Amino acid sequence: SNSLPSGYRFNEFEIQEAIGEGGFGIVYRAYDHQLERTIAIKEYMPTSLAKRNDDLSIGLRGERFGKTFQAGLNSFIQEARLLARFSHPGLLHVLRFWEENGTAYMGTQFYSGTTLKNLQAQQPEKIDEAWIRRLLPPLFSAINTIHQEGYLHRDISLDNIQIQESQLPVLLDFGSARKEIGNLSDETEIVLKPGFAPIEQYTEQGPWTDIYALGAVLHTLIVGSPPPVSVVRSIEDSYQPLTERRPAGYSPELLRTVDRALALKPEDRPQTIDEMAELLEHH
Ligand SMILES: Nc1ncnc2c1ncn2[C@@H]1O[C@H](COP(=O)(O)OP(=O)(O)OP(=O)(O)O)[C@@H](O)[C@H]1O
Ligand SMILES: [Mn+2]
Helix, strand or coil, rough: CCCCCCCCCCCCCEEEEEEEECCCCCEEEEEECCCCEEEEEEECCCCCCCCEEECCCCCCCCCCHHHHHHHHHHHHHHHHHCCCCCCCCCCCCCCEEEEEEEEEEEEEECCCCCCHHHHHCCHHCCCCHHHHHHHHHHHHHHHHHHHHHCCCCCCCCCEEECCCCCCCCCCCCCCCCHHHHHHHHHHHHHCCCCCCCCCHCCCCCCCCHHHHHHHHHHHHHHHHCCCCHHHHHHHHCCHHHHHHHHCCCCCHHHHHHHHCCCCHHHCCCCHHHHHHHHCCCCC
16 A cells, blocks of 8 residues: 555665555565565554655655654664674564665565464464474574573564464564554554563563463464453453363463463563473473
């Protein structure tokens, strides 16, 4: 809708197709004619704040949006810098960054496959316990790599995990610009992800914060929907443990691991990714 057309050029880069269009950015499949390789280009584009001009630059929808637009842009830059710290198969690899068209762009590695959200919607029968147990070692590795450098993800759900055709996962996006815009605009609904964010994110954060969201992802894969919103749980905890529900085809060991990651209070969860991984052993 707002996307650059196939054939658009950024010097050596050529746009091939808009493959993702959300409220806050566009993702393109593109081609580097100098290195003769396919890449992705992520374009900052907050549709509530900005529109596409005739010359294909980006312009404010209203002059009052300039401060929030710039703050989102700054957060987009900071996220690119964070991802540029890593060279890990499970984290989105950043090749280049530049500003143009009144906005900003990340050139990144192009990944095969699709999101975990799309895989769960389109092929849920592929997702069983054996598949989940193959997913977890590389997913654990990617998350732990963030933690070991002193950072947290804080936006994990099914929507921003890529599942490659190899089935290996990639963490694509931390939602930084979206969340900054939401906080400044009082659009609270775009900051935290209901059912994935644990209680301490609503206002003490650490690796256990991401571990809860990973538990919520796993819960969604096993029974089809995330657990109750954590603030609602903090009033009256209506979470039914998976070890009691006993969904068909799932071991108590995997179920219990998910339940422990979803402990309401941070101190009751696995405290590190390594601690959570240890729970899946002894079987
Ligand atoms: N580096 C990358 N390589 C390949 N694909 C990517 C990359 N980064 C993001 N994507 C894809 O971009 C899309 C971003 O999803 P978003 O919700 O913004 O767009 P969408 O138009 O709703 O896409 P979808 O087809 O997933 O519904 C996802 O389909 C994701 O797989
Ligand atoms: Mn979609």
